[PDB]
Design an enzyme around this catalytic site. Structure first.
Site, PDB file in Angstrom:
ATOM      1  N   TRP A   1      -1.627  23.000 -26.951  1.00 20.35           N
ATOM      2  CA  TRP A   1      -0.240  22.903 -26.670  1.00 20.35           C
ATOM      3  C   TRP A   1       0.342  22.069 -25.715  1.00 20.35           C
ATOM      4  O   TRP A   1       1.152  21.228 -25.901  1.00 20.35           O
ATOM      5  CB  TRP A   1       0.322  24.395 -26.921  1.00 20.35           C
ATOM      6  CG  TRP A   1       1.706  24.377 -27.160  1.00 20.35           C
ATOM      7  CD1 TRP A   1       2.565  24.809 -26.434  1.00 20.35           C
ATOM      8  CD2 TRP A   1       2.506  24.238 -28.356  1.00 20.35           C
ATOM      9  NE1 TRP A   1       3.967  24.888 -27.177  1.00 20.35           N
ATOM     10  CE2 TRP A   1       3.555  24.425 -28.348  1.00 20.35           C
ATOM     11  CE3 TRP A   1       1.932  23.605 -29.604  1.00 20.35           C
ATOM     12  CZ2 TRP A   1       4.512  24.205 -29.151  1.00 20.35           C
ATOM     13  CZ3 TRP A   1       2.976  23.456 -30.615  1.00 20.35           C
ATOM     14  CH2 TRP A   1       4.374  23.748 -30.369  1.00 20.35           C
TER      15      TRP A   1
ATOM     16  N   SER B   1       2.992  26.820 -16.334  1.00 18.53           N
ATOM     17  CA  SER B   1       3.798  26.726 -17.916  1.00 18.53           C
ATOM     18  C   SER B   1       5.234  26.225 -17.466  1.00 18.53           C
ATOM     19  O   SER B   1       5.332  25.087 -16.722  1.00 18.53           O
ATOM     20  CB  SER B   1       3.619  27.982 -18.292  1.00 18.53           C
ATOM     21  OG  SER B   1       4.036  27.656 -19.759  1.00 18.53           O
TER      22      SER B   1
ATOM     23  N   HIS C   1      -4.803  28.792 -21.404  1.00 15.76           N
ATOM     24  CA  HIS C   1      -3.486  28.515 -20.576  1.00 15.76           C
ATOM     25  C   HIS C   1      -3.242  29.809 -19.786  1.00 15.76           C
ATOM     26  O   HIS C   1      -2.995  30.864 -20.364  1.00 15.76           O
ATOM     27  CB  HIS C   1      -2.600  28.431 -21.765  1.00 15.76           C
ATOM     28  CG  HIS C   1      -0.920  28.264 -21.246  1.00 15.76           C
ATOM     29  ND1 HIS C   1      -0.450  27.023 -20.888  1.00 15.76           N
ATOM     30  CD2 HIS C   1      -0.123  29.139 -20.965  1.00 15.76           C
ATOM     31  CE1 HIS C   1       0.839  27.198 -20.262  1.00 15.76           C
ATOM     32  NE2 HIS C   1       0.988  28.483 -20.715  1.00 15.76           N
TER      33      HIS C   1
ATOM     34  N   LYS D   1       6.576  22.993 -14.874  1.00 22.85           N
ATOM     35  CA  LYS D   1       7.436  22.022 -15.165  1.00 22.85           C
ATOM     36  C   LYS D   1       8.605  21.901 -14.131  1.00 22.85           C
ATOM     37  O   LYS D   1       8.968  20.833 -13.466  1.00 22.85           O
ATOM     38  CB  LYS D   1       8.276  22.253 -16.416  1.00 22.85           C
ATOM     39  CG  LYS D   1       7.556  22.393 -17.736  1.00 22.85           C
ATOM     40  CD  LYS D   1       8.142  22.623 -19.066  1.00 22.85           C
ATOM     41  CE  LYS D   1       7.464  23.223 -20.087  1.00 22.85           C
ATOM     42  NZ  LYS D   1       6.475  22.722 -21.032  1.00 22.85           N
TER      43      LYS D   1
END
Length: 397
Positions: A329, A238, A379, A242
């Site tokens: 998402w 998540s 997720h 990044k």
């Protein structure tokens, strides 16, 4: 509003990793390595993540002892890594489990709730940094305590990694910069940011600060003769994926880069505008990106980069993009399409690129130099994701 329908994805054109900003075609490996790569990294710094400030970093490492653990299966080390000699000295704790013959390959990543959350082990130090409340993990206060030991262990499959010959290492992201869930624009920081060589718009990045943290951990690994610092895989989930993707991109010492459900401003193509968008991420999380990135709210088609060019920064070294099927998402198809858009650079540098034409069906790793996996369910980081990480690492590392 937000779109989760593939049929409503807009038409777009991606910038070409293999075209110089001046319009010259990039036709050789030499040209990528000598000119284009750095140019692409400088676009990411200036427009998206921000630049790490210059001037020397004076890391100090504790002891590094080494104690039997997971009875024992493993050696545990905890190292405090401080930035300079003064009080206080930003500092972060590095927790390391290694299998109990040769320098050990290691998976390294940031955790969300403190080192003590990644395994029950009573010896893990309790962080003093601020922690978020989290309903799923029963974390109700902002000061860490022992009641949450081991609660995030599912995301860090230590016993599994160790049995396969890998060590696992971790740092709580909040020792590096807390990522508060409330706004704090104090005056002192407003004024400190003006007297700076890098102008405010181009300065780092929560994400870039966290990624610098991971590179400081590689500095430690270089000093530790029990760890193979040439076989470190940087991973993250998540917002911390990044980070892992950026860290692995720009710090070429990492052997392998793993992005787990990193989505918008990570693996996912910004131009697709599917699930989370640029405006949305910058609105919710104004400190994550450089402030220049805020000018591209609702204007993803004017970005000078997109996330295929980030993945291309990792070339030639292996990169794994892992997505979760329910994680709309994050734009799982966009994460795959970013990986696809780096294929030509990776082929130019002599590797297999991405061995996939279509977005692949769930739960079978594409194990080419650019790797891709689409994991059924939510997720999260799960036991299955670790099986995938290790299958990839066993092939490439």
């Amino acid at each position: 509003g937000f779109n989760y329908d593939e049929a409503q994805v807009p038409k777009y054109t991606l910038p070409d990793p293999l075209v110089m900003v001046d319009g010259t075609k990039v036709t050789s490996a030499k040209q990528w390595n000598d000119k284009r790569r750095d140019e692409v990294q400088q676009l990411f710094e200036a427009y998206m993540y921000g630049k790490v400030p210059d001037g020397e970093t004076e890391l100090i490492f504790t002891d590094a002892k080494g104690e039997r653990a997971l009875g024992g299966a493993a050696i545990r080390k905890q190292v405090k890594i401080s930035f300079g000699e003064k009080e206080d000295a930003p500092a972060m704790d590095l927790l390391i489990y290694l299998p109990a013959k040769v320098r050990v390959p290691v998976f390294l990543g940031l955790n969300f709730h403190g080192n003590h959350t990644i395994h029950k082990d009573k010896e893990i130090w309790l962080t003093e940094s601020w922690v978020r409340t989290n309903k799923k993990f029963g974390i109700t206060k902002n000061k860490a305590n022992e009641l949450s030991r081991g609660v995030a262990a599912g995301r860090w499959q230590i016993e599994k990694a160790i049995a396969k010959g890998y060590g696992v290492a971790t740092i709580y992201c909040g020792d590096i910069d807390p990522d508060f869930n409330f706004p704090s624009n104090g005056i002192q920081a407003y004024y400190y940011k003006k007297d700076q060589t890098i102008p405010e718009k181009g300065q780092w990045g929560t994400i870039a600060a966290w990624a610098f943290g991971l590179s400081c951990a590689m500095d430690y690994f270089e000093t530790d003769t029990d760890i193979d610092h040439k076989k470190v895989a940087v991973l993250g989930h998540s917002r911390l994926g990044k980070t892992s993707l950026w860290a692995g991109a720009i710090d070429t010492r990492f052997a392998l880069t793993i992005s787990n459900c990193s989505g918008c401003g990570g693996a996912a193509l910004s131009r697709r505008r599917f699930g989370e968008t640029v405006r949305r991420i910058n609105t919710s999380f104004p400190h994550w990106f450089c402030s220049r990135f805020h000018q591209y709210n609702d204007k993803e088609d004017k970005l000078p980069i997109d996330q295929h060019m980030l993945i291309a920064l990792c070339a030639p070294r292996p990169v794994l993009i892992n997505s979760a099927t329910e994680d709309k998402w994050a734009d799982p198809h966009g994460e795959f399409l970013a990986a696809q858009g780096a294929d030509a650079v990776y082929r130019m540098l002599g590797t297999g690129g991405l061995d996939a034409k279509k977005w692949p069906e769930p739960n079978k790793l594409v194990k080419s130099t650019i790797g891709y996996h689409l994991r059924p369910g939510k997720h999260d980081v799960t036991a299955r994701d670790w099986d995938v990480y290790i299958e990839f690492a066993d092939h490439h590392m």
